[PDB]
């Protein structure tokens, strides 16, 4: 809630939130992050390493196309 409050306050003055909105934002964040993490896991596996590394996430993003 602190992070979302800060980001919204940076984006727009004097905003308010619904509690349900903040909860939905948390749920969506967790879903996206778990998807990203599993993609990173598959990437690291392909590298033949168990230690996931930032490049694995970057690759996941590129193949997904969030930064291509």
């Amino acid at each position: 809630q602190r992070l979302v409050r800060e980001i919204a306050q940076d984006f727009k003055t004097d905003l308010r939130f619904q509690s349900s909105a903040v909860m939905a934002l948390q749920e969506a964040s967790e879903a996206y992050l778990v998807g990203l993490f599993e993609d990173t896991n598959l990437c690291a596996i392909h590298a033949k390493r168990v230690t996931i590394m930032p490049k694995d996430i970057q690759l996941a993003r590129r193949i997904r196309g969030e930064r291509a």
Partner: protein, 108 residues
Amino acid sequence: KASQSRSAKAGLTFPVGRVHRLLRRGNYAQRIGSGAPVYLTAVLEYLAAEILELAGNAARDNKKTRIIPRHLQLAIRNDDELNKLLGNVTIAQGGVLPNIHQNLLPKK
């Protein structure tokens, strides 16, 4: 005096009249064929029944009488055609199907 709903005439539980009104209000076309709302009601009822059956099977196998989002996620992710249908959809508090890559396990 007495009358019977168009849903009963079609033999559908979903409110075909409400579907017809929602279609009309959605302004999707200037003219709406009377067969469109019934057809929509039928397909929607079939999909609802299928998903509900899957959820109920999940509930029974979990041995819990009340469907919670976990059960819905299990059902949706299991049925591969629905899984591919809804791949961009996330279910609140649904969680994920357990999955471990073989090479991560020490053995067996």
